[PDB]
Amino acid sequence: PEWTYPRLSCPGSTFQKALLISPHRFGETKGNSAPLIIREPFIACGPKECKHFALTHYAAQPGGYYNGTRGDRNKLRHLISVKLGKIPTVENSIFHMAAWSGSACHDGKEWTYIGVDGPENNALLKIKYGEAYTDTYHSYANNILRTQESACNCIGGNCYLMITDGSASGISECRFLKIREGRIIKEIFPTGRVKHTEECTCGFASNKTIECACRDNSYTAKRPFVKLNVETDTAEIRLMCTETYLDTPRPDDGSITGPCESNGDKGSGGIKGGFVHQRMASKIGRWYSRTMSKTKRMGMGLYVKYDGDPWTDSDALALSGVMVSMEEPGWYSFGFEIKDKKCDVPCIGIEMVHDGGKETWHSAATAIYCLMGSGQLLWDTVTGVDMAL
Amino acid sequence: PEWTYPRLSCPGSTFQKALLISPHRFGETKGNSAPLIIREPFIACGPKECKHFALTHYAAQPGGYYNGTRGDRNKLRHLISVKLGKIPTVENSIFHMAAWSGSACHDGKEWTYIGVDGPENNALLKIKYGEAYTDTYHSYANNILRTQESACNCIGGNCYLMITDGSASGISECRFLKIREGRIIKEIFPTGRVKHTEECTCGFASNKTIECACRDNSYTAKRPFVKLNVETDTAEIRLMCTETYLDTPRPDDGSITGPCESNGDKGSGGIKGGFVHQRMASKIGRWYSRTMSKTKRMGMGLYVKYDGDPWTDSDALALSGVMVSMEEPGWYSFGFEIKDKKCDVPCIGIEMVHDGGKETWHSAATAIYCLMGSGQLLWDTVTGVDMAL
Amino acid sequence: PEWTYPRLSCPGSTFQKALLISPHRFGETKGNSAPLIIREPFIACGPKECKHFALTHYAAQPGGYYNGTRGDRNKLRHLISVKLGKIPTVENSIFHMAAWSGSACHDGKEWTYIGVDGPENNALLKIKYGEAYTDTYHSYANNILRTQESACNCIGGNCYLMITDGSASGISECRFLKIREGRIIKEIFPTGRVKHTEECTCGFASNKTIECACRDNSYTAKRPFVKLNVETDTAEIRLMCTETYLDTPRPDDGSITGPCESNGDKGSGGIKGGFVHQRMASKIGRWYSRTMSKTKRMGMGLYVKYDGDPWTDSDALALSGVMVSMEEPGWYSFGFEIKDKKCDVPCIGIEMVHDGGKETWHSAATAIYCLMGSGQLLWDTVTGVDMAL
Amino acid sequence: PEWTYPRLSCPGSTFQKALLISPHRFGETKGNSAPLIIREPFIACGPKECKHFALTHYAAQPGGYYNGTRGDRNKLRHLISVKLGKIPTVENSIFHMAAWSGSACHDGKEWTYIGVDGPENNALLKIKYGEAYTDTYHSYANNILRTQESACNCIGGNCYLMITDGSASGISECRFLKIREGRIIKEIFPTGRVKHTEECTCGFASNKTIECACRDNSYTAKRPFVKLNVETDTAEIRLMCTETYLDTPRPDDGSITGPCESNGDKGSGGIKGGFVHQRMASKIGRWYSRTMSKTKRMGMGLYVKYDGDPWTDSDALALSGVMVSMEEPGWYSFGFEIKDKKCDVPCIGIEMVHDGGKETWHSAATAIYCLMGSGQLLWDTVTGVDMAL
Numbered sequence A, B, C, D: 001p002e003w004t005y006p007r008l009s010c011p012g013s014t015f016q017k018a019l020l021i022s023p024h025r026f027g028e029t030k031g032n033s034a035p036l037i038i039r040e041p042f043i044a045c046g047p048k049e050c051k052h053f054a055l056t057h058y059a060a061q062p063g064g065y066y067n068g069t070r071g072d073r074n075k076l077r078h079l080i081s082v083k084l085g086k087i088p089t090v091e092n093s094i095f096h097m098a099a100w101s102g103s104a105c106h107d108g109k110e111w112t113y114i115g116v117d118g119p120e121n122n123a124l125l126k127i128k129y130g131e132a133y134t135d136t137y138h139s140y141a142n143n144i145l146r147t148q149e150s151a152c153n154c155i156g157g158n159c160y161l162m163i164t165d166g167s168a169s170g171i172s173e174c175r176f177l178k179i180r181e182g183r184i185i186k187e188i189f190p191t192g193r194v195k196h197t198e199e200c201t202c203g204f205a206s207n208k209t210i211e212c213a214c215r216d217n218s219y220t221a222k223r224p225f226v227k228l229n230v231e232t233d234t235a236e237i238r239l240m241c242t243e244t245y246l247d248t249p250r251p252d253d254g255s256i257t258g259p260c261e262s263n264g265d266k267g268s269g270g271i272k273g274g275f276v277h278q279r280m281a282s283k284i285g286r287w288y289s290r291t292m293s294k295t296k297r298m299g300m301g302l303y304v305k306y307d308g309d310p311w312t313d314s315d316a317l318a319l320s321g322v323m324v325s326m327e328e329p330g331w332y333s334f335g336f337e338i339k340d341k342k343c344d345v346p347c348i349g350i351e352m353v354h355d356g357g358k359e360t361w362h363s364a365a366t367a368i369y370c371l372m373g374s375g376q377l378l379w380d381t382v383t384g385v386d387m388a389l
């Protein structure tokens, strides 16, 4: 085997509904299954297999450790995986490492797994290459060192990973790590709008450039948009100029007055957002998702734009279809690419959390839409789950 | 590995009882298992493995989502598989894609999986090659785009698949897709009796010809019998002329008066029907199955005829044996071929549904009969399942 | 890969306790597991893997299909397997074929699986090579066609299998089948004492000879002892002359008066009995087991004799150790050989049935003793199972 | 494949928290899982996989055989394994052999599994190579023949294994076995302080030397420290001279007066103790663990020393971090090494037993710390388990 590289995307002009992973369809009192209580799911693929990752609270439904599964960082939290298509239950899953923030990626030869844990004021990112623990990176703003919550991206054996550190309601200047066979070989300090950037959903815009659509949890409902040159290992960041604000909460589209850099209103709070690339011979499509509701983690819609500079185009994004209706949950979303024989298939997954407050369990299903065929996005996704069962 | 082709069938002159997959033997209140609630089971094999496919309601027994498992098309429905011989439970199964109509096939190199979902008036057939979503085909009569509910058939890397679209009580003109590495490369429009054809059970009658025995749900209890030339990609369809009507409901054998094309009576309603080929040096056997009851989905008998043209022979089909007695359920049946070292073993599977009305769960067992040895078919199959447990 | 042959056994002069497979340790009401209800367990090994076979009633503990699991031949009965060392539960097992009597063996290249089902008066032995159903053999005395209930034996790709047919309290003249790549290529009709022989535990005494220790259920408590020449495909059968009667029930050792052929008393009833070969350069050891009790299926002892002719030696068999004490069940026992890198390891397995009458469940554990090291057999085996749980 | 040898350790200067295997997070009355009741866990790795071993009581939680799971040696006890990262439940585990004391190791080509069972006064160590039972070694001081309770160590296909025999409150002179392809090829009788030595945690200090840190249960709270030359097959043993006594119970550090050989006080009782090597070009680090409490099996601290002779250095060991706080259980600990592509990753596992007295169940979680990155050990481990559930 040899190193993997981004290829031209597979033919198609529309996303369609692909697969639902709803493991809680199986966590009834009256049932006999043990789906793991998770959140922050995400898929990463290699040349032969696609793995469905998530952060588990080390509990199952039905269980007796529902208390604290609405929290985020504890000492029991773990990065787990199953082959995509398998229900992530206690026995099906494999536990990779302790983590309350995670990522993973295949480089053609082997899986890199990333997972941050540690105290809040001195957390610690850890890297595992296949079976071996290989490296770590230390907290630099001493306020909750975090990572992508989605797939990292490897080119010629170099995996690139966003990490961030800083306040949730103040400065969270992010960084990128360059990782080779599990070991950190460069710190890349981005330039530009670096005020606050977290949970980058990165993908290859081409062999030269990784682009990421991130979360600002303090200042704006515009997504910070990262452009990384993987040949000079240089990174720049500016807000997305589009009127189609992709964060949640957000104000009305086009209502943020001023040039492309204006913050301005409803910018505190946020949400991880889907983003994936469709690479064609002489054209690039940028697919995105955002909640159907402006203030709440309900529904998910798919948007798209072809070419241009996202840093300057105020043009509205083309609404492509309703993936999760306003009546269903749509929490985190993320991009990934399945590898066909000679081309890459761009997909967007959606974390569809089952939220009943802190007095019960708290987990998520996963909805997957992929680029397949021509025409219009046809069907929405439901979890099917009743949380009283 | 190289592409697969139909071979001469293994020696034998009789079917025998081979295997029972009854996963609800294990879904008792008192038990500790989770068989998946399914219907439309079907088996397809490649050179080293036979996979047992079904359409699941994304529910298990015992569970709490029995309501709606007597329906057919919903947003939770999925194509699932296990290795044939494994009980399809929550953890053993792999979920392939969202589907309320399905098919699958191996071409020598890889698995093609076919699944239709979407709204009733604009459904959408989707194709997955191994792990990648590769292609789609759109609704053309805007009334419930359907596929085979059984194995597709690949020759020299070209998989051929029946699709139909149309009213259940009127015109449902079918089509064939020719699929190569997961992508559609030709639409084949059949000629002749094309009034209504659905759920074709197709097999290779040879290296030149796919033949299918199908359902007409409107007009006749004679099966539409499709002959597809895979060298010119041309398809012709006519009713089976035999007095041994294979659909359900049906009238008395021989009682449909007139030439081979006469409809005539009890033609509305139907059932998917077993059919598999026994290819000998200079002789072809055609094995079929049909319910033991004339109006109900009870029992299943095996029939056979050697040579001739099914389009013209009114000759009764030879009753070969009672596979499932009149006292047991016999719903859908389908054909498939296991690959021995140097020859192909023709088999017929039987969907044996556990029907207790819409106020309880609704799933199926799977009975398998294969061509093995000489003599007379010896033993019938029972599910052993009591639905009250 | 190439065909397998018997080799010289591994160094050692004593059996020791190896492994217990007691799946019902896990079938409590208060538990969350589903061990399969079985009987007639047996192990067969190939060059990389040892498989643990059993006949299942298609039920689990805890379940609701306990009624009829004390019977033997029904329509739900199946041959199942797990990798030796795995608990045979619903999900771990693979179902091979419908069978109420079975056997299996590896030939170096692939698994042959044998299973008889069918009506009592016209049962049917079926053969499956890997995934394919390949051949069948018909009932010849129209009274319960049966097979070994243990591993068949393959040499240079020819697997040899005892089958019997006939009354349980009268004549049951056995036969041997010679099987190549799943197909029957010769019927071998044994000569000599052929009055009644069933459940042969066969092994290779060398490259030229298969020997079997069998059950007579009518006439004697001496084991019929089969010697098969695999070079001329000829079989001969005579009672075992030893005073150490291996059947159950049996009279006192040495109390059957007359020459080696005398029946005489307590001969009706019987039990399948362990037997395995230790092949050394210029010496052959014959290891056997028999119940600790003379009339009941309680306890199991290991016996041994080096060289001689079992057909003529009235010498007592050397008592080698107590494998299951008189307080624990010892039902069927069987021999098998694990393959080390350059030598074969002879083993004896013991079916330890959990019997509580027909008003509850009826299954078995499996105790394994193998040839390992020097000295005296050290420890006995218990199921650990309380049947009220 | 070829034989494996100790390599230079991977870069790093600190241990960090890696993974928690807490299978009882899933053994609630309210749940639907079956973790196995175990103790004496330990990990051993080969070139592609790390296996998590334990000694099971052949019972699960929840279940009905909690009585006797606080004992140690019974006839049901087994050596079991899962792939490290998998929860050891009934179905995930593989049962290797009956054992109430165990070890295992990869040699580059295959797994050796070691397991002692038998009566107290004539126990029996058994060896299995892959699938085959290959050899045994007999009790020599007729008082509980014991082995390491952790990974053996293979160099050039020779696996070396500590065994001990003797009273728990008197003389237990240990021995080493040298095992090749599952067969014993040399007995090594150590010299020096051989009064009492059990449960050696051995690793390669280099290509020439295995070193072990062991338990004296009678005489001292200093660990016996074994140095084995694998080129001349000679072993020597002396107390560790450090003031940082690693056993439990123990007195105050430095308070044992006299030279390096002084016993003296609180020496009865003991605990198996973590110990792993960090091999650098021209420097060796020795990492150890010991309970946070002086008398109780509570907490676990990581210690380290670079170079010197542990037989003579009274220097205090460097306290490196708190792995399990005083509030959590810290029973047995052990060392092991994961294999990265070109270097070995030293790790220390911690048995974190759930002890509620003999009137309830008794099993353990497993905490893993590995050498990864630079800086200070950052986070402690908790089981998360409430034993009332």
Ligand SMILES: CCC(CC)O[C@@H]1C=C(C(=O)O)C[C@H](N)[C@H]1NC(C)=O
Pocket (backbone or CB within 6 Å): A040, A072, A073, A100, A101, A144, A146, A168, A217, A270, A271
């Ligand atoms: C750390 C700040 C960040 C934004 C508030 O918290 C995230 C919000 C979450 C959320 O908004 O869904 C869930 C994440 N588990 C959480 N992250 C971590 C690493 O704990």
Ligand SMILES: CCC(CC)O[C@@H]1C=C(C(=O)O)C[C@H](N)[C@H]1NC(C)=O
Pocket (backbone or CB within 6 Å): B040, B072, B073, B100, B101, B144, B146, B168, B217, B270, B271
């Ligand atoms: C669309 C009508 C058609 C036959 C009239 O429905 C089928 C009948 C069924 C049946 O005849 O058993 C069950 C099938 N699950 C169903 N098909 C779909 C695709 O939903």
Ligand SMILES: CCC(CC)O[C@@H]1C=C(C(=O)O)C[C@H](N)[C@H]1NC(C)=O
Pocket (backbone or CB within 6 Å): C040, C072, C073, C100, C101, C144, C146, C168, C217, C270, C271
């Ligand atoms: C045909 C009778 C014969 C001996 C009495 O049968 C065996 C007896 C049995 C027994 O004595 O345990 C159990 C076996 N399952 C049984 N075989 C069948 C095929 O039913």
Ligand SMILES: CCC(CC)O[C@@H]1C=C(C(=O)O)C[C@H](N)[C@H]1NC(C)=O
Pocket (backbone or CB within 6 Å): D040, D072, D073, D100, D101, D144, D146, D147, D167, D168, D217
């Ligand atoms: C035999 C003496 C030894 C030290 C007292 O006992 C050990 C005590 C234990 C303990 O002290 O944790 C657990 C061990 N499972 C047990 N050993 C065996 C091999 O059965």
Ligand SMILES: *[C@@H]1O[C@H](CO)[C@@H](O)[C@H](O)[C@H]1NC(C)=O
Pocket (backbone or CB within 6 Å): A005, A006, A007, A008, A206, A207, A279
């Ligand atoms: C990227 O580079 C590799 C060669 O290194 C090439 O095979 C691949 O086609 C290129 N990808 C794109 C998207 O051009």
Ligand SMILES: *[C@@H]1O[C@H](CO)[C@@H](O)[C@H](O)[C@H]1NC(C)=O
Pocket (backbone or CB within 6 Å): B005, B006, B007, B008, B206, B207, B279
């Ligand atoms: C079909 O063609 C292939 C060669 O392409 C051949 O190997 C096979 O035997 C043929 N099958 C039949 C049924 O004639």
Ligand SMILES: *[C@@H]1O[C@H](CO)[C@@H](O)[C@H](O)[C@H]1NC(C)=O
Pocket (backbone or CB within 6 Å): C005, C006, C007, C008, C206, C207, C279
């Ligand atoms: C049996 O024959 C084969 C060669 O065909 C040989 O390799 C093997 O050692 C022989 N077995 C015995 C037990 O002599």
Ligand SMILES: *[C@@H]1O[C@H](CO)[C@@H](O)[C@H](O)[C@H]1NC(C)=O
Pocket (backbone or CB within 6 Å): D005, D006, D007, D008, D206, D207, D279
């Ligand atoms: C040990 O020896 C082998 C060669 O046999 C070598 O490859 C390896 O690097 C050596 N290990 C150390 C720690 O020096």
Ligand SMILES: [Ca+2]
Pocket (backbone or CB within 6 Å): A216, A217, A218, A219, A220, A221, A222, A247, A248, A249, A266, A267, A268, A269, A270, A271
């Ligand atoms: Ca925001």
Ligand SMILES: [Ca+2]
Pocket (backbone or CB within 6 Å): B216, B217, B218, B219, B220, B221, B247, B248, B249, B266, B267, B268, B269, B270, B271
């Ligand atoms: Ca009809």
Ligand SMILES: [Ca+2]
Pocket (backbone or CB within 6 Å): C216, C217, C218, C219, C220, C221, C222, C247, C248, C249, C266, C267, C268, C269, C270, C271
């Ligand atoms: Ca008898």
Ligand SMILES: [Ca+2]
Pocket (backbone or CB within 6 Å): D216, D217, D218, D219, D220, D221, D222, D247, D248, D249, D266, D267, D268, D269, D270
């Ligand atoms: Ca001590």
Ligand SMILES: [Y+3]
Pocket (backbone or CB within 6 Å): A091, B091, C091, D091
């Ligand atoms: Y399970």
